[PDB]
Design a protein that fits this description.
2 copies of one chain form a homodimer.
Chain A lengths: L18 E2 L11 E6 L12 E6 L2 H11 L4 E9 L4 E18 L2 E21 L5 E7 L4 H14 L10 H11 L4 H9 L3 H14 L2 E4 L6 E4 L12 E5 L5 E7 L5 E8 L8 E8 L5 E8 L8 E6 L3 E3 L1
Antiparallel strand pairs in A: 1-5, 2-7, 3-6, 4-5, 5-6, 6-7, 8-9, 8-16, 10-11, 11-15, 12-13, 13-14, 14-15
Helix pairs in contact in A: 2-5, 3-5
The structure holds the ligand CNC(=O)COc1ccc([C@H]2CCC(=O)NC2=O)cc1 (2 copies) and zinc ion (2 copies).
PDB class: ligase
Keywords: E3 ligase, protac, TPD, molecular glue, targeted protein degradation, ligase
Assembly: dimeric
Chain lengths: 315, 319
Amino acid sequence: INFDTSLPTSHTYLGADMEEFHGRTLHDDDSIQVIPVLPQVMMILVPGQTLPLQLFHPQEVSMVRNLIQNDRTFAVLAYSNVQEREAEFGTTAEIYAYREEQDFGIEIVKVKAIGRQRFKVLELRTQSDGIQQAKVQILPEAETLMDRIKKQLREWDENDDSLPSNPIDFSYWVAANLPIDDSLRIQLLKIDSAIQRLRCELDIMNKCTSLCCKQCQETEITTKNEIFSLSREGPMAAYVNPHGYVHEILTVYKACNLNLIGRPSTEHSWFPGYAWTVAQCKICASHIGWKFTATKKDMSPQKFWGLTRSALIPT
Amino acid sequence: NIINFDTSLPTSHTYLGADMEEFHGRTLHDDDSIQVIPVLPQVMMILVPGQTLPLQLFHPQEVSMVRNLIQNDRTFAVLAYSNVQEREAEFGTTAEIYAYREEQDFGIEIVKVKAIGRQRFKVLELRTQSDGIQQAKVQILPEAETLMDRIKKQLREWDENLKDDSLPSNPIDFSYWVAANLPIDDSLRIQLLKIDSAIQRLRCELDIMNKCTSLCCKQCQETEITTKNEIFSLSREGPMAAYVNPHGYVHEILTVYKACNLNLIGRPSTEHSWFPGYAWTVAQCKICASHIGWKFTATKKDMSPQKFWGLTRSALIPT
Ligand SMILES: CNC(=O)COc1ccc([C@H]2CCC(=O)NC2=O)cc1
Ligand SMILES: CNC(=O)COc1ccc([C@H]2CCC(=O)NC2=O)cc1
Ligand SMILES: [Zn+2]
Ligand SMILES: [Zn+2]
């Protein structure tokens, strides 16, 4: 495995002149705050998880510009029902990198943020100018469980320095990287105790199955056991396509029942040194993810896949 | 200068998919009536009766709303924002869905729609529900052939093809064709939409045409890019039309035969092309490198014109 696993976390495709912020805002337990939510964000976010964004609607640009002038923190709601904008919990996201640019006269803002604190939603109110403000309450934050989880993680993929040592940070690493659906992510986000969070995760890893194509609900694509981490963030990560759409990707060493489309391409690659090719379901041709292929034959691995969470469903 | 290409192809939006469902039904609201019509949250374009609006919708709340629209009157409200940055709008126009197709990419439900502007309105109430959707309480508004010939005369002096069949015979439709196709900024579009009477609209448009100057790149303002005399129409919609990029972003572009102070980026491409038979290359300002639009180049030697430019309204300001 010869590849710098610190390059993906940099999101260099998004831009390399990104202004950086080192100030850190952290709210007290049980404190009630009013935090804006970005209307296009759909992701469930946990503390320690990074969220890259590319925004071009003038209202999102203005609100990020104002956040950058202040505490740089927005609210990422854990929607139980994104079609209905229903959410009871969420995680704050603190912008740590920022970039302005223009394209065709349209002001664009590129942002890189990281989850900081869980919160319970108290009120979701929309302003007269359309922007949404959420009144939230900041929630407060067993090495046997940790060792047991780390044990079954090594059984799935041979991956210590990669995993956090603190039980709180480790519980959130596991919550954000397990190949689980949204309902289980929200279940884990509701849990207040790291001990309880780790114990629920152990139960989830054991009931885990395999990943089928959602459009088929039949054809198996990959499994926990080919999960393969190419990034310090872990085997699961959010990346932005060239037009602002955020994909959550699970990297696996081998996949089944998948065809390729088009020509391997290096543009806007989420894994520097690698080229991507659209992978679709060999049964329904539903796009599922991308196969990445080395650009220099001196790199290991030579082939790996990055499959979107949204295209997969567990058995 | 002579055209050897089917100007009815661009209006079909075949790049959006050629197997679009269509609807024969037509809904029209009574004059001076209050209607409650939903507003798509990411639409930003100023719409006029008779104008086409293509869309590609990703958000599950958008596709739910449009799915429900397809099962009802297929009509949403397009606001003419004074300030998009703050959702400030006093007038608008209804858009009726006339074509539709559902897709699914990476497990994400996708809706593509082609809609046409029908009736303009004044907004009485904008109110966002609990789920986030915006509903607009609106009042449908009620709807000198010398001005018409005077308008048409200076249109021909800009482009020869803008002559007869390319232009509507009715003064109401004609004032809306002109409002949608003049190379004017958003403040003038809103001014024309506010006008209640067609004769008043036509006379305002004649005044605007006489004061029309040139189009400069927005970022640096100094460099001219094109001018009204270089306009020429390659679609039955007219010289000005909205098209969707492959990711759902709607671009309003003006087609012109010649542009200055523009460099090109890379090699021509035929993917997702808005003008079948032509390839596109990103065009950018010579001075400040800002992307301005696209140069279109024919893929066959027997096509005419062999080259033209589609320049976005958003990158251009008047002189
Ligand atoms: C016509 N265009 C489209 O439909 C969308 O185009 C895309 C979408 C996703 C990417 C990913 C691929 C993986 C990677 O490494 N980086 C990316 O941005 C690239 C282009
Ligand atoms: C990083 N950029 C991408 O991945 C692709 O972005 C685009 C944007 C606009 C187009 C237009 C060009 C003109 C035309 O005729 N059709 C289009 O769709 C095409 C691709
Ligand atoms: Zn399938
Ligand atoms: Zn310029």
